[PDB]
């Protein structure tokens, strides 16, 4: 069976680990030589202990899919320093590993979304942590880190009504911040050598769009390279940034419709903040006193505040203290009390003409890679 | 010569006067191992031998090699600074060395990783002075060791390290009783970050403290606080005079102080936009759109002169300005921003599309 | 942009100078007849919204 | 018609720019140890100053990463002197700390770690100390009493005094007297740390009595 082979080559992995015994620069980072998509160990190990990835299995269950069954992360305080050549794969295999994920699993034919997010997320963290460990400085793999970045930005909108056992959006946002930060530490050291990027300003716009509430990011806009400071993506990002701090929402939701697709969901990160400030400002504006109320029409508020129909606007408008009547809302200063589950706003997802994987690739898909792990 | 110098070290050690020993170890004077080691205590044995090595490396123009000797000086001084149990005669000596290492980082950058490797020991000089726990205390030169880290970490731009350094000084008993040169240099820097944190009022008391007590003889240090006060002032609305800008020969703001007084601002902004993306200035200095909007409201109010003013006229006044795609919703949005922030009194009526402004106190003075 | 150190460690209250009335506020007046408020008048008097 | 009548700052910085040694900058990423939480991000800039913290959070966030990455950064190499004491009263966590001290000191040959856990008598620990003098001593409080009373451990050069899982330390009597007695042989100037998984209202005033000008992290 697989268990005796597991014990034999786990024993060989142990005595190979005993065959090695440390300075700052005398020990080079030691690029590994494993070729397959899930070592040679881990598939058998996960087959006996019933840790099976629910998508990529042989559909008669039992046997692990030896052609394709991708790895999971496990931060476990792993006393083994992540094996030796095996479990860490060299640079051409990383592109194939990302390419098989854009090719077939993010276009999921049938299945739920809770297992799908965990399946793609816990893998892309594995490629990210292994390129981190591998210590490789190339222009090819930082594009793959940007692929996991675009995947995280897409999943920041694609699952928002999903349950708290499935998504729990805070740890996803905390991961996506470290994605773009790995982009910044990669490209500062790359530009200091003298290698430029074709799409630098797109994720620099993603960085400026991720930190509108942090006031220091203004100063970060100063020390860019003037080519990337004068680029149109960063110039969209600064004009988007000068709509929170001056609190201009009409200009803001005019810049939503003129944006790209991937920028629009990062503008959907600040979704309830803008209309809270807008309903504070318009209620203070249109009221002469604190004892009487003035009529505001529904067509104006659904025109200004990006609300895709009447029902979402009216739900937001009665879940804040105000009362909708026919085609009007009674803006009142005294009854405005601060007291909601977020939703899927259709005006972002209508801005995706391409399919999902072609969003992550940002262009043409490669052909399907075929490998024979023997 | 060297023997007279070493007898001066002997007199400075034995009479425990730290100003004299600080003067002998500095480069302000005109002014290797065995002669320094045959007579001194073993931290002071390495200390002045490395001072002589730093003098010879200055004379060799070997500014990389001078930095590690001037690291050996301050490590030996820190080991001697441990050796004085609850005593502080050697505390003016630190100003002789920790001021030097900053510029001896800079030359070692030329011939920033070296600024970093200089920047990690001066943390430990803060640790030693912050460890001791009034007239005999070791904490008088603590604030000097925050004004040498602040002149390194803004040249590399790291801000996240320096928010216990503000917390250590600001929560202290003796924070209002430091030396008057260092307590006004520091009050700039925590003011400067208070410009970038959208907390301008905290920067209003500090840099006005930094501007008023700055010395007459160094005009450049007056000029720098003037440069960094000019965004946080006139956002409050201080509105400078022409004579100030003529006296400090800094005349680029002046046309801006025309256009903020009453597009003119965009033309005067893009004419010299390369000065305002040079000192972290333009994205701060764009935020007076909302007060120049009130000044354009004052120009419409003084030229049409009634209580209720129609919004089509302010739309026309912005269509003169001609920047990017102004419509009737943008006008009423930024007018509502002005009307809840407090600059413009009144109410917006959508039924007649007319703005009423206040009758007895039209726009309140800042 | 380097904020240089001061020449002396201590000084008195008379040694430095103020410049008196420079952080001054008289600009919030009703001076209408400036020339830049002429052009802002004229285009507002070309669209036919007329008042004194 | 009618006249008028009169946010969150999420963490940014990575482990490259907390501003460590290169010896702790290569070994921090060869494990793949990345993406800081807010506990390290709010604790390590103050813990490298020599100031004093009282932070708590749940498991899986990296308290132990904080009190190795601060205290190995502050430790200068002393020639056969003891400078770091960690008391935690739990048998498995001592082995985790003494293994991860060797994991994070991938460079450092001079930093020698020994753990004096319990159950292996008193004279074996004295033979371990006499055969080689480590810089760092880790052990249960009840054992380090009988190591401290018998004039065998030099405790007069303690610079850093770290407590881990202090909740079960100070909820039980006849062990807070142990902590108050082991506190006295330390010098008056030192850095004292404090870590726990859970805290309560009745334990708050005594925990500030070991440290000067404390700071609070509570998840709540
Ligand atoms: N940011 C991180 N990235 C990766 N691994 C981490 C990180 N932080 C901690 N770890 C690892 O996670 C392990 C588990 O530590 P952890 O559970 O956080 O300790 P703990 O919180 O003190 N447990 P407890 O005492 O019950 O609160 C540590 O030993 C580290 O090896």
Give the whole-angstrom CA distance, residue A98 versus residue B258: 57
The 3-state DSSP class for residue D163 equals strand
Q: Determine whether the shortest distance from the Cβ of D47 to ligand 1 is under 6 A.
A: no
CA distance A330 to B253: 46
Residue ranges covered by each domain of chain D: 23-217
Q: Give the start-to-end residue ranges of the domains of chain C.
A: 1-47
From A157, B110, B238, select the one nearest C19 (Cα to Cα): B238
Same domain, A145 and A172: yes
The pair of structure tokens assigned to C14 is 């008379």
Q: Which residues in chain B have Cβ-Cβ distances shorter than 8 Å to D49?
A: 123, 126-127, 130, 164-165, 168
Task: Return the residue in A20, A30, A73, A77 with the most chain D beta carbons within 10 A, the one to mutate for interface testing.
Answer: A77
CA-to-CA distance for A315 and A343, rounded, in angstroms? 12
Residue A37 lies in a domain: yes
Distance, CA of A66 to CA of A14 (rounded, Å) = 23
Does A210 lie in the same domain as A185? no
D75 in contact with ligand 1, CB cutoff 6 A: no
Give chain C's length: 52
Question: DSSP strand E in chain A: where?
Answer: 294-297, 324-325, 328-331
Which residue's CA is the nearest one to ligand 1's atom 11? Answer: A77
> What 8-state DSSP symbol labels residue C22?
T
Neighbours of chain C (3+ CB pairs under 8 A): B
The CA-CA-CA angle for residues A238, A240, A245, to 5°, reads: 90
Number of domain units in chain A? 3
Are A125 and A143 in the same domain? yes
DSSP string of A70-131, one letter each residue: ------S--TTSS-SSTTS--HHHHHHHHHHIIIIISS-SS--SHHHHHHHHHHHHHHHHHH
User: Across the interface, do C22 and B304 touch by the CB < 8 Å criterion?
Assistant: no
**Domain's final residue, options A237, A258, A279:** A258
Contact state of D3 with B307 under an 8 Å Cβ cutoff = yes
The gap between the terminal CA atoms of chain C, to the nearest Å, is: 51
Q: Which residue has the tokens 């640790």?
A: B127
Structure tokens at D42: 């709010």
> Does residue A140 sit in helix, strand or coil?
coil
Q: Between the CA of residue D11 and those of A184, D40, D203, what are the distances in Å? A: 15, 10, 30
What order do you get walking across the sheet with D84-87 strand by strand?
D113-116, D136-139, D84-87, D160-163, D191-192
D58 is in an annotated binding site: yes
Alpha-carbon span B243 to B251, nearest angstrom:
10
Decide if D1 and B349 are in contact by the 8 Å CB cutoff. Answer: yes
Assess if residue A249 is contained within a domain: yes
Q: B42-60 and B2-14 are packed helices; what angle lies between their axes, rounded to 10 degrees?
A: 140
Chains C and A touch (3+ CB pairs under 8 A): no
Q: Which two tokens stand for residue A197?
A: 């990027």
Q: Do B and D have ≥3 inter-chain CB pairs under 8 A?
A: yes
**Residue contacts between A and B (CB atoms, under 8 Å):** 72
Sign (positive/negative) of CA torsion A135, A137, A140, A146?
positive
Q: Is residue A75 part of a domain?
A: yes
**What tokens appear for D45 in the block?**
């800039």
From the list C3, C8, C9, which residue is nearest B224 (CB)?
A: C3
Q: Are residues A332 and A234 in the same domain?
A: no
Taking a C-beta distance cutoff of 8 angstroms, is the pair D164, D88 a contact?
yes
* Residue D161: strand pairing partners: D85, D192
Atom of ligand 1 minimally distant from the CA of D34: 3
Q: What's the distance, CA A114 to chain centroid?
A: 16
Resolution (A): 3.5
**Number of other residues whose CB lies within 10 A of the CB of residue B121:** 16
Q: How was this structure determined?
A: cryo-EM
CB C42 within 8 A of CB C33: no
User: What is the distance in angstroms between the CA of the first residue and the CA of the last residue of chain D?
Assistant: 53
Instruction: For a ligand 1 pocket test, name from D62, D104, D195 the mutation site with the most ligand atoms within 8 angstroms of its C-beta.
Output: D62
| Domain span holding position A72 | 2-193
Q: H or E segment at A131?
A: helix A114-134
Residues A183, A300 within the same domain: no
B321 phi, psi to nearest 5 deg = -70, -40
Q: Are residues A63 and A187 in the same domain?
A: yes
Task: List C-alpha distances in Å: B190 to B163, B183, B187, B193, D53.
Answer: 10, 11, 6, 5, 24
CA Rg, chain B, in Å? 28
Domain spanning D23-217: which CATH class is it, in words? alpha beta
Nearest CA to D49 out of D77, D74, D22 is that of D74
The rounded distance, in Å, linking the Cα atoms of B168 and D59 is 30
CA–CA distance, B187 with B184 (Å, rounded to integer): 5
Task: Provide the 8-state DSSP code for C35.
Answer: S
Range 323-362 of B in CB contact (< 8 A) with D? 345-347, 349, 352, 356-361
Question: Between chains, do B196 and A246 touch, taking CB under 8 Å as contact?
Answer: no
Close Cβ partners of A329 (under 8 Å, ≥ 6 residues apart): A295, A296, A297, A298, A301, A317, A322, A323
């Amino acid at each position: 069976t697989s268990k005796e082979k597991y014990r034999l080559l786990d024993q060989r992995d142990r005595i190979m680990r005993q065959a090695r015994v440390t300075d700052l620069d005398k020990a080079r980072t030691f690029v590994g030589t494993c070729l397959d998509m899930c070592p040679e160990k881990e598939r058998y190990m996960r087959e006996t202990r019933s840790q099976l990835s629910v998508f990529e299995v042989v559909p008669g269950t039992d046997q692990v899919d030896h052609a394709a069954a991708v790895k999971e992360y496990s931060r476990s305080s792993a006393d083994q320093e992540e094996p030796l050549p095996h479990e860490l794969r060299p640079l051409p295999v990383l592109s194939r590993t990302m390419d098989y994920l854009v090719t077939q699993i993010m276009d999921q034919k049938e299945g739920s979304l809770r297992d799908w997010y965990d399946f793609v997320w816990n893998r892309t963290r594995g490629i990210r942590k292994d390129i981190t460990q591998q210590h490789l400085c190339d222009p090819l793999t930082v594009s793959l880190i940007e692929k996991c970045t675009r995947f995280h930005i897409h999943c920041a909108h694609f699952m928002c009504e999903e349950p708290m056992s499935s998504f729990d959006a805070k740890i996803n946002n905390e991961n996506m911040t470290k994605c773009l930060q790995s982009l910044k530490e990669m490209y500062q050291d790359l530009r200091n050598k003298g290698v430029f990027c074709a799409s630098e300003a797109e994720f620099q716009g993603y960085n400026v769009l991720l930190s509108l509430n942090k006031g220091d990011i203004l100063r970060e806009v100063q020390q860019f390279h003037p080519a990337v400071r004068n680029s149109s993506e960063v110039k969209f990002a600064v004009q988007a940034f000068a709509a929170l701090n001056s609190n201009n929402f009409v200009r803001f939701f005019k810049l939503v419709q003129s944006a790209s697709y991937l920028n629009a969901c990062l503008l959907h990160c600040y979704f309830s903040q803008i209309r809270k400030d807008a309903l504070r400002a318009l209620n203070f504006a249109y009221t002469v006193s604190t004892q009487r109320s003035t009529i505001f029409p529904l067509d104006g508020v659904v025109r200004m505040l990006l609300f895709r129909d009447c029902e979402e606007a009216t739900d937001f408008l009665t879940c804040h203290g105000l009362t909708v009547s026919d085609g009007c809302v009674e803006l009142n200063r005294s009854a405005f009390l601060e007291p909601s589950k977020t939703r899927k706003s259709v005006f972002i997802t209508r801005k995706l003409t391409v399919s999902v994987g072609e969003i992550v690739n940002g262009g043409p898909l490669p052909p399907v890679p075929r490998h024979t792990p023997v | 010569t060297i023997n007279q110098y070493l007898q001066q070290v002997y007199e400075a050690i034995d009479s425990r006067d730290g100003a004299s020993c600080a003067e002998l170890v500095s480069f302000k004077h005109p002014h290797p191992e065995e002669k320094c080691q045959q007579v001194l205590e073993p931290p002071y044995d390495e200390m002045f031998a490395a001072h002589l090595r730093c003098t010879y490396a200055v004379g060799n123009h070997d500014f990389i090699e001078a930095y590690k000797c001037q690291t050996v000086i301050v490590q030996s001084f820190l080991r001697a600074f441990q050796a004085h149990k609850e005593e502080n005669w050697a505390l003016p000596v630190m100003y002789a060395v920790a001021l030097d290492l900053r510029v001896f980082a800079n030359n070692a950058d030329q011939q920033g990783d070296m600024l970093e490797k200089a920047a990690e020991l001066l943390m430990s000089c803060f640790r030693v002075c912050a460890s001791d726990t009034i007239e005999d205390s070791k904490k008088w030169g603590m604030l000097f060791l925050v004004n040498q880290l602040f002149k390194i970490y803004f040249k590399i731009n790291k801000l996240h390290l320096c928010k216990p350094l503000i917390r250590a000084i600001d929560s202290s008993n003796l924070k209002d009783d430091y030396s008057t040169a260092q307590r006004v240099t520091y009050k700039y820097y925590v003011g400067r970050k208070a410009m970038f944190d959208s907390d301008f009022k905290q920067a209003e008391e500090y840099l006005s403290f930094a501007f008023e007590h700055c010395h007459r003889s160094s005009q450049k240090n007056k000029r720098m606080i003037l440069i960094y006060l000019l965004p946080v002032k006139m956002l409050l609305g201080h509105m400078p005079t022409v004579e100030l800008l003529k006296k400090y020969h800094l005349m680029q703001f002046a046309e801006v102080t025309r256009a903020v007084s009453e597009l003119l601002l965009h033309e005067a902004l893009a004419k010299h936009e390369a000065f305002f993306i040079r000192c972290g200035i333009f994205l701060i200095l764009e935020k007076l759109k909302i007060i120049t909007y009130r000044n354009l409201f004052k120009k419409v109010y003084l030229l049409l002169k009634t209580h209720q003013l129609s919004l089509d006229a302010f739309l026309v006044a912005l269509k003169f300005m001609q920047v990017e795609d102004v419509d009737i919703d943008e006008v009423q949005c930024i007018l509502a921003n002005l009307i809840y922030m407090g600059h413009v009194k009144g109410y917006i009526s959508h039924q007649h599309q007319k703005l009423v402004v206040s009758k007895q106190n039209p726009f309140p003075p800042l | 942009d380097e904020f240089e150190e001061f020449p002396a460690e201590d000084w008195a209250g008379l040694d430095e100078d103020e410049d008196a009335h420079v952080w001054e506020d008289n600009w919030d007046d009703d001076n209408v007849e400036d020339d830049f408020s002429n052009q802002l008048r004229a285009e507002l008097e070309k669209h036919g919204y007329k008042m004194e | 018609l009618l006249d008028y009548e009169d946010y969150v700052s999420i963490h940014s910085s990575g482990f490259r720019d907390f501003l460590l040694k290169p010896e702790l900058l290569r070994a921090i990423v060869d494990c793949g140890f990345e993406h800081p939480s807010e506990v390290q991000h709010e604790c390590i800039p103050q813990a490298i100053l020599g100031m004093d913290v009282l932070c708590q959070a749940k498991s899986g966030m990296g308290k132990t990463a904080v009190f190795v990455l601060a205290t190995l950064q502050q430790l200068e190499p002393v020639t056969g002197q003891v400078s770091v004491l960690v008391m935690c009263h739990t048998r498995e966590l001592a082995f985790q700390i003494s293994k991860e001290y060797e994991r994070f000191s991938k460079y450092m040959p001079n930093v020698k770690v020994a753990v004096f856990f319990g159950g292996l008598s008193i004279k074996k620990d004295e033979e371990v100390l006499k055969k080689n003098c480590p810089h760092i001593v880790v052990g249960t409080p009840g054992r380090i009493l009988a190591l401290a009373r018998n004039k065998s451990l030099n405790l007069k050069h303690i610079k850093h005094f770290i407590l881990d899982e202090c909740d079960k330390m100070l909820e039980q009597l006849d062990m807070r007297r142990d902590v108050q007695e082991i506190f006295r042989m330390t010098p008056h100037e030192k850095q004292v740390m404090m870590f726990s998984a859970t805290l309560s209202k009745e334990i708050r005033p005594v925990c500030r009595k070991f440290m000067q000008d404390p700071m609070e992290i509570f998840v709540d």
